[PDB]
């Protein structure tokens, strides 16, 4: 069918900068005709052309256009003018999960469980569509007005080809603290690489910092491939067990991966015993304190 009229910059009143990326800026904007607020990601054409970033922009648009699930930032529209590309995104009013980890220091068990469950639910959806995120981290897990998660940053995601039953992706992307050992050693990532990142994130929610810590990337890489980390005291025992079943060097042995028979066993883990999985995005999140 036809679609709505293509939008233009003059259709919006732009407000504050929400954040700045290496080759993008996200600005809060109100659509004049509706009074709706959007986070509009803006890229300068000559800059991403000069700096060979066009593939990432195309990737972000293509991957986001495939998503239809409440735990992801939504791509509503795109438009361009002579100088710029514009992505109209849902506005995640409460910002990055990382902000809350820093502020509060350590999530309690109820909050760790709830937010872990939402991330697991989101990954189940993404992996079911054959998509690897590859840069899952608290900075990329935003929070909407109701404090549900909104995962973002899909420019470095990968749609695995169904036609070839593709399992491995060859682009080297990610963030050192959360990068999987297989990417470092085998030079490819798989869906299970996101489960490794999940393990790091669960650890971080409880411990306050992610498990592989150092002042530079190479030192972090060295720890990752040796599985060199420890748990702080008082780390919730069932959460520790879960993390130990995710932070596994062999990607085929991580709870939740295809070779471990998928998300059923992961959702069945004792840490999640009280979770109602079916309708998390309609549940009231526990207050973060
Ligand atoms: N949909 C959104 N709603 C609210 N805030 C957002 C949204 N998308 C991004 N932001 C904020 O804007 C910041 C900049 O995002 P952008 O994707 O342009 O760069 P980045 O991913 O932070 O940086 P880099 O691309 O260099 O890794 C984000 O870190 C986030 O805090
Ligand atoms: O189909 S696209 O891949 N075409 C593109 N045209 C350009 C032009 C200049 C630059 Cl720097 C990148 C792209 S890429 C595309 C359009 C668009 C608009 C807004 C947000 C993302 C994208 S991707």
Swiss-Prot record:
On induction, the UniProt comment says: Stimulated by insulin, and the oxidants hydrogen peroxide and peroxovanadate.
The alphabetized UniProt keywords are: Acetylation, Activator, ATP-binding, Cell junction, Cell membrane, Cytoplasm, Kinase, Membrane, Nucleotide-binding, Nucleus, Phosphoprotein, Serine/threonine-protein kinase, Transcription, Transcription regulation, Transferase, Ubl conjugation
Q: Name one GO molecular function term.
A: ATP binding
The active-site annotation reads 135 (proton acceptor)
Q: How does it sit in the membrane?
A: Peripheral membrane protein
Sites binding ATP sit at 22-24, 41, 90-92, 96, 139, 153
| Tissue expression profile of the protein | Appears to be expressed ubiquitously.
Q: Give residue numbers for the modification (Phosphoserine).
A: 171
Q: Where is this region: PIF-pocket?
A: 43-87
Could you tell me the Gene Ontology terms of the biological process aspect for this record? actin cytoskeleton organization; calcium-mediated signaling; cell migration; cellular response to epidermal growth factor stimulus; cellular response to insulin stimulus; epidermal growth factor receptor signaling pathway; extrinsic apoptotic signaling pathway; hyperosmotic response
The entry's stated outcome for residue 207 to V is: 3-fold increase in kinase activity
Where does the protein principally reside?
cytoplasm
Modification after translation, per record: Phosphorylation on Ser-171 in the activation loop is required for full activity. PDPK1 itself can autophosphorylate Ser-171, leading to its own activation. Autophosphorylation is inhibited by the apoptotic C-terminus cleavage product of PKN2. Angiotensin II stimulates the tyrosine phosphorylation of PDPK1 in vascular smooth muscle in a calcium- and SRC-dependent manner. Autophosphorylated; autophosphorylation is inhibited by the apoptotic C-terminus cleavage product of PKN2.
**EC annotation from Swiss-Prot or TrEMBL:** 2.7.11.1
Q: Which principal EC class is assigned to this enzyme?
A: transferase
What is the top-level taxon of the source organism?
Eukaryota
Q: Does the keyword Cell membrane apply?
A: yes
Per the record, its GO cellular-component terms are:
cell projection; cytoplasm; cytoplasmic vesicle; cytosol; focal adhesion; nucleus; plasma membrane; postsynaptic density
Compartments, record wording: Cytoplasm; Nucleus; Cell membrane; Cell junction, Focal adhesion
Comment field on protein domains: The PH domain plays a pivotal role in the localization and nuclear import of PDPK1 and is also essential for its homodimerization.
Q: Per its database record, what is this protein's job?
A: Serine/threonine kinase which acts as a master kinase, phosphorylating and activating a subgroup of the AGC family of protein kinases. Its targets include: protein kinase B (PKB/AKT1, PKB/AKT2, PKB/AKT3), p70 ribosomal protein S6 kinase (RPS6KB1), p90 ribosomal protein S6 kinase (RPS6KA1, RPS6KA2 and RPS6KA3), cyclic AMP-dependent protein kinase (PRKACA), protein kinase C (PRKCD and PRKCZ), serum and glucocorticoid-inducible kinase (SGK1, SGK2 and SGK3), p21-activated kinase-1 (PAK1), TSSK3, protein kinase PKN (PKN1 and PKN2).
Binding partners and assembly: Homodimer in its autoinhibited state. Active as monomer. Interacts with NPRL2, PPARG, PAK1, PTK2B, GRB14, PKN1 (via C-terminus), STRAP and IKKB. Interacts with SGK3 in a phosphorylation-dependent manner. The tyrosine-phosphorylated form interacts with PTPN6. The Ser-171 phosphorylated form interacts with YWHAH and YWHAQ. Binds INSR in response to insulin. Interacts (via PH domain) with SMAD3, SMAD4 and SMAD7.
Family assignment from sequence similarity: Belongs to the protein kinase superfamily. AGC Ser/Thr protein kinase family. PDPK1 subfamily.
The protein depicted here goes by the name 3-phosphoinositide-dependent protein kinase 1
Its source organism is Homo sapiens
Complete-protein stretch covered: 71 to 359 of 556
